[PDB]
Design an enzyme around this catalytic site. Structure first.
Site, PDB file in Angstrom:
ATOM      1  N   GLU A 136      42.778  46.215  35.890  1.00 37.61           N
ATOM      2  CA  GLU A 136      41.424  45.957  35.408  1.00 37.61           C
ATOM      3  C   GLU A 136      41.263  46.024  33.877  1.00 37.61           C
ATOM      4  OE1 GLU A 136      39.043  46.904  39.515  1.00 37.61           O
ATOM      5  OE2 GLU A 136      39.425  48.710  38.311  1.00 37.61           O
ATOM      6  N   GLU A 177      44.724  44.844  46.164  1.00 36.30           N
ATOM      7  CA  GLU A 177      43.754  45.723  46.811  1.00 36.30           C
ATOM      8  C   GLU A 177      42.975  44.881  47.818  1.00 36.30           C
ATOM      9  OE1 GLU A 177      41.347  47.341  43.600  1.00 36.30           O
ATOM     10  OE2 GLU A 177      43.132  47.727  42.396  1.00 36.30           O
TER      11      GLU A 177
END
Ligand SMILES: O[C@@H]1[C@H](O)[C@@H](O)OC[C@@H]1O
Ligand SMILES: O[C@@H]1[C@H](O)[C@@H](O)OC[C@@H]1O
Ligand SMILES: [Mg+2]
Ligand SMILES: [Mg+2]
Ligand SMILES: [Mg+2]
Ligand code: NA
Ligand code: NA
Ligand code: NA
Ligand code: NA
Ligand code: NA
EC number: 3.2.1.23
Lengths: 1015, 211, 174
Positions: free
Chosen positions: B69, B145
């Site tokens: 991220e 994820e």
């Protein structure tokens, strides 16, 4: 803190408190000033008289110097290198580091330059906005103090370091204190082959930017398929408080005409999950039928970036020159604006013989004018980013530039020891990234380079990929680790040969023709360095250009290099002389290896320059009958400032001449039929010479500039008329010691012990100071000596093979000496053997035929043992008593030419002062030869035949014994060397044998004939 | 990068590991503000290079990851290439900036759905079945994820597995995540209770989102 | 110098005097111990009881702490997170930074954990060879001193930071 941290011995610390890098700023507060590129009141120069004091180490600098001027300090000009003011010695070393290799440590004895300036700051500057100081070049590391308070630190000698001084400055009188270290951990990445200097050697300045400011801007230009439409894309970044009323206007100017404009608020497109850059905006301007930039036609536009309020208040303007061009690689070819480039390039160091590494406009402009006048279209920044003005000038005059990061670690073992080390990646990345950030808007930069001679390491791959993401508009090249690694878009070898493989383990230099087609290989090949122009060099240059023109993917290269790195020293009488490595007490050094230029330090051309100009011609010629076919090698321009001048001559005598206007499309052809030629009267060879002349002056050349030329042999009429029979007949006179020949005032003497013509008379005046003798040797060229490092006594070098074979100490042993009387002539026959330690190297058999006319015909046949190294020459030499002002010849000229460097010379009747017949190479060697000579006139003497000669006041012996040109002394009379045959000079590199087989004297048996007489 | 013993255990017990650089700049605006900035490249490179130097002999590590991220910046591209030169033996993945950038060998989205597209601007999350066959796309897709197991969750889990089994290039993924990040606190009677964000006077906090 | 430099507010300084990274080492001096992955006498654990004192800022740490234990310090287990001992609060935030976003700067109130350990070194380690210390995880940055003398600095909470102590160690109690 400063002495304790020792930041100059930590590659993890390359700066402290340094501002972000960016394109050139001026902070104009008037948009019209920005447009016209007139001076900015917000950008002040701090160049001029500074105060300076030298120290042996930083630990020796007294604390008082931070606040008060030192009384022992001198007043010096800045920018300068402190070696040029005499404070310590410049060092010339090539590969071996000037410091012990112990990264990241430097010597405890570290020459320290303490610079200081007292200067005025206006109140207006401190009331609002930001005041920064810019140092364009500081070598090699420095700490900065303002009014006694520490500001920051910086490394990298070749890019600007900028510091915010807003909180340090006071109104009125201020003082800067700069502590510059000669050596730092930065020096491990600055091992370029050049003079090792230090100091504040580029411009210092003060820039005032508003609080709300243009902090960065990028210009891109993309095109449709045929370049009839472009889009200018300008990304602009701000600093300061974000406000809805803020705007950027980017307007595009062609002269005084605005062609395009766009205005937008800040706030870029969405980039990721967190939004976009609120502090950036991208303007897109449509441009129909843009005028494209190239080295052929450097069309430029002006982009003005205005930061302003919506309602019309200008905050500041920045600007740049914009050249519309596309650089891409497609299908293995480097294209500029859709067309394959042919790079006529040169490497150019930043060097001045008086001022060292400090650059100035006049020198820069001079260099560019000479390059373009000599048919270069590209330059490589070997091996660091240049003075910012260089790029502006290349944009404007039109030269393709390779911008090169300041990274060279040549002296490491192996070469990639640091560049493969992730701990050196930060130091290296700043040298790449800050370059790109500075120079990305210059149209002249077409290729980025990761540096020089640092092997290939993973850091190179990481940094290659960084540039490719940040700037897709330019190919990236890098030579290290074998010239074809994964860190280069272009196969870019140094000194790879045309046809000859050099199969070094791990990093071979394949023949460039072979390299292109190796299994899987598809890239273009442009030599980053080729044709090492060290001293009497550039032999085999034509072979490169021939291959460049025949092979699409061979797209040229960059000659090594532009200018000799000789420095000025002064003798006992204050007379200047050119110095090289070692001449400043500098040791270890690599001597004359710093001089590899096509031009002398003062920009006077070496003879090699004309060879480069000729081979790099933009017009090619073929002849079929009386039809000249001109072909244009321009890609973009029509020949609209070109006329062809043609001349037909018979052995130098003009018979016809005219001129035709050139009207050739880029890449096109034009046929010119010559008018009917008048039939030659006397015998001899007709020669056609064509010259392309530019009638009108340009930004880079005077009216009448000759840009291209070519010669052909036309009709030959062989002489069949016998010489008129003579009434007179020469008388022999014999003694046990001599053969004397007499005819009127003319007299010849052959010594019967030596076997040579020892004397000759006209009137009763002696003509010789040394007997006429065979010569099989030359004063060795730099290429013959073939060392790149002072310490490598190479047995494979030509000079060493000649020495070990005894060529230089061989003694003539007489085998035969006889006289004969014929009907109209005396005939002398001789034979000699040359021997060293029981081995016969050469045998010379001669006949001297002196007849009633007064002419001596010398017939020479030579045998050369097949197992002795091929000799440098096969000819005769003597020292003439006469010194004359002029030398007149029918042969190749007018400049020095050798068998592998003679394509630029033209056959004609040449007449020069004696001095022009000697080439003042700083390191003296065989020089000034002229080939293809049918006739030579010097005073009362004339020689005829088919030979090569040099003529000067210096013996081959003096030349090889004297290390510097200024130490030479004119000997009594004139030394003449007349060669039937002369070996090539080579130059593909200067540190291994480089003379091609076809230019070696290997035929075993040699024949030539000469006729000597009086006029 | 984890505790050294983790790799030893995964080597011996048998688990494929994705070893991930300690780089996350989620809170930046935009998310790549630091990772596109050359001045942050040095700090970033040390986090990648020193990971590789440490863990490259572990057989369990099969994939290198450039972090989490931090958008997509040019520093990512540089560090991607650095690993590829130094260690050709393992693929490099990285989800930031749209999960299919030039800095990843594997299409590695987070929470891309099986059949439903989420066409967010710049960084869309295509249906994983659709993602595979976008014009010119050739890479495998493994979700870095998926199936956010927050509280009463994992509805639609079977839909992923059906898709993984039907599509060769849909090669699975990593559930988010293994263990609730709840911490023990004690009431007045000295009895243990599971606490989340806010329960330590921490503010701002994100409450139960740690579980 | 350590306070004046503020290396924890400079992304250009991520370490000082830190050794190069490498795969796990034990420096076995016996081949069979290496083969079987048994303990190495050249690899010692410093885990266990240390001395710890909390401070609101680095500026609040007294210079006396470099050479002498602070009476106010507690005895705690290491490795540990000091929030798990009650010294200050752990913070749960997802995206939003736990500090004002202003790179490279951090809050002036910057919780500081002062760890110290008195330890003994074998005689033969002092005369010959290289003794390094290895910190597998320190969150988020630290300066290191040995016997009052500054050794180095390190960042990155999730990889080992190693320093050569060879020149810093003395006979007996360090
Ligand atoms: O040292 C110079 C150059 O930097 C190198 O690449 O080739 C030899 C030349 O003389
Ligand atoms: O490779 C060449 C040689 O190895 C060195 O000694 O001189 C410079 C040139 O690059
Ligand atoms: Mg340093
Ligand atoms: Mg070099
Ligand atoms: Mg830091
Ligand atoms: Na070509
Ligand atoms: Na050189
Ligand atoms: Na000489
Ligand atoms: Na599958
Ligand atoms: Na969570």
């Amino acid at each position: 803190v400063v002495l304790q941290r020792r930041d100059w011995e930590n590659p993890g610390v390359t700066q402290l408190n340094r501002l972000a890098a960016h394109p050139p700023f001026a902070s104009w507060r008037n948009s019209e000033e920005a447009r016209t590129d007139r001076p900015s009141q917000q950008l002040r120069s701090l160049n001029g008289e500074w105060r300076f004091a030298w120290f042996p180490a930083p630990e020796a600098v007294p604390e008082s110097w931070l606040e008060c001027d030192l009384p022992e300090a001198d007043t010096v000009v800045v920018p300068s290198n402190w070696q040029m003011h005499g404070y310590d010695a410049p060092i010339y070393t090539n590969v071996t580091y000037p410091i012990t290799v112990n990264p990241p440590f430097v010597p405890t004895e570290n020459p320290t330059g303490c610079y200081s300036l007292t200067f005025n700051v206006d109140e207006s500057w401190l009331q609002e906005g930001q005041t920064r100081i810019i140092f364009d070049g500081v070598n090699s590391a420095f700490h900065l103090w303002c009014n006694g308070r520490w500001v920051g630190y910086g490394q990298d000698s070749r890019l600007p370091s900028e510091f915010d001084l807003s909180a340090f400055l006071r109104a009125g009188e201020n003082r800067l204190a700069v502590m510059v270290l000669r050596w730092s951990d930065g020096s491990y990445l600055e091992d370029q082959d050049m003079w090792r200097m230090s100091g504040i050697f580029r411009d210092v300045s003060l820039l005032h930017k508003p609080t709300t400011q243009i902090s960065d801007f990028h210009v891109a230009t993309r095109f449709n398929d045929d370049f009839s439409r472009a889009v200018l894309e300008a990304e602009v970044q701000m600093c300061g408080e974000l406000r809805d009323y803020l705007r950027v206007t980017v307007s595009l100017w062609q002269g005084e005409t605005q062609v395009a404009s766009g205005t937008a608020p800040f706030g870029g497109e969405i980039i990721d999950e967190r939004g976009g850059y609120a502090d950036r905006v991208t303007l897109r301007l449509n441009v129909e039928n843009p005028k494209l930039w190239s080295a052929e036609i450097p069309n430029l536009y002006r982009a003005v970036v205005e930061l302003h309020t919506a309602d019309g208040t200008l905050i500041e303007a920045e600007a740049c020159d914009v050249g519309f061009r596309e650089v891409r690689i497609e299908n293995g070819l480097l294209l500029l604006n859709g067309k394959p480039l042919l790079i006529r390039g040169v490497n150019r160091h930043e060097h001045h013989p008086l001022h060292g590494q400090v650059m100035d406009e006049q020198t820069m402009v001079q260099d560019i004018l000479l390059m373009k006048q000599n048919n270069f279209n590209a330059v490589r920044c070997s091996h660091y980013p240049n003075h910012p003005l260089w790029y502006t000038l290349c944009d404007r005059y039109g030269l393709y530039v390779v911008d090169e990061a300041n990274i060279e670690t040549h002296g490491m073992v192996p070469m990639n020891r640091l560049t493969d080390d992730p701990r050196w990646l930060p130091a290296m990345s700043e040298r790449v990234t800050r370059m790109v950030q500075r120079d990305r808007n210059h149209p002249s930069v077409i290729i980025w380079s990761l540096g020089s001679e640092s092997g290939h390491g993973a850091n190179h791959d990481a940094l290659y990929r960084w540039i490719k993401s940040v700037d897709p508009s330019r190919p990236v090249q890098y030579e290290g680790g074998g010239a074809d690694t994964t860190a280069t878009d272009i196969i870019c070898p140094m000194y790879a040969r045309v046809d000859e493989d050099q199969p070094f383990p791990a990093v071979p230099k394949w023949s460039i023709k072979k390299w292109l087609s190796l299994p899987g290989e598809t890239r273009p090949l442009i030599l980053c360095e080729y044709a090492h122009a060290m001293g009497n060099s550039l032999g085999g240059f034509a072979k490169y250009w021939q291959a460049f023109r025949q092979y699409p993917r061979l797209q040229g290269g960059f000659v090594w290099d532009w200018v000799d790195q000789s420095l000025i020293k002064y003798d006992e009488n204050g007379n200047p002389w050119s110095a090289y490595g070692g001449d400043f007490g500098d040791t270890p050094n690599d001597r004359q290896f710093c001089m590899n230029g096509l031009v002398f330090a003062d920009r006077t051309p070496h003879p090699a320059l004309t060879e480069a100009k000729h081979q790099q011609q933009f017009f090619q010629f073929r002849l079929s009958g009386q039809t000249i076919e001109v072909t244009s090698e321009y890609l973009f321009r029509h020949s609209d400032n070109e006329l062809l001048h043609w001349m037909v001559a018979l052995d130098g005598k003009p018979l016809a001449s005219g001129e035709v206007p050139l009207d050739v499309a880029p890449q096109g052809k034009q046929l010119i039929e010559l008018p009917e030629l008048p039939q030659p009267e006397s015998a001899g060879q007709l020669w056609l010479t064509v010259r392309v002349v530019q009638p009108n002056a340009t930004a880079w050349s005077e009216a009448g500039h000759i840009s291209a030329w070519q010669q052909w042999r036309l009709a030959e009429n062989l002489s069949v008329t016998l010489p008129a029979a003579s009434h007179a007949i020469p008388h022999l006179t014999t003694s046990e010691m001599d053969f004397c020949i007499e005819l009127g005032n003319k007299r010849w003497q052959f010594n019967r012990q030596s076997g040579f013509l020892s004397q000759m008379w006209i009137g009763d005046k002696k003509q010789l100071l040394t007997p006429l003798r065979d010569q099989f040797t030359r004063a060795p060229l730099d290429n013959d000596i073939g060392v790149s490092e002072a310490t490598r006594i190479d047995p494979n070098a030509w000079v060493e093979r000649w020495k070990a074979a005894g060529h230089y100490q061989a003694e003539a042993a007489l085998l035969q000496c006889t006289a004969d009387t014929l009907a109209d002539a005396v005939l002398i026959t001789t034979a000699h053997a040359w021997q060293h330690q029981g081995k016969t190297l050469f045998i010379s058999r001669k006949t001297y035929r002196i007849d009633g006319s007064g002419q001596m015909a010398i017939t020479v046949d030579v045998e050369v043992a097949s197992d002795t190294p091929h000799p440098a020459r096969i000819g005769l030499n003597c020292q003439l008593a006469q010194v004359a002002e002029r030398v007149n010849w029918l042969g190749l000229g007018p400049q020095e030419n050798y068998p592998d460097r003679l394509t630029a010379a033209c056959f004609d009747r040449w007449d020069l002062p004696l001095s022009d017949m000697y080439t003042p190479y700083v390191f003296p060697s065989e020089n000034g030869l002229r080939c293809g000579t049918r006739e030579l006139n010097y005073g009362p003497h004339q020689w005829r035949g088919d030979f090569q000669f040099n003529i000067s006041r210096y013996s081959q012996q003096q030349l090889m014994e004297t290390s510097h040109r200024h130490l030479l002394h004119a000997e009594e009379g004139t030394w003449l060397n007349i060669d039937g045959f002369h070996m090539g000079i080579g130059g593909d590199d200067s540190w291994s044998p480089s003379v091609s087989a076809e230019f070696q004297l290997s035929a075993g048996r040699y024949h030539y004939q000469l006729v000597w007489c009086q006029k």
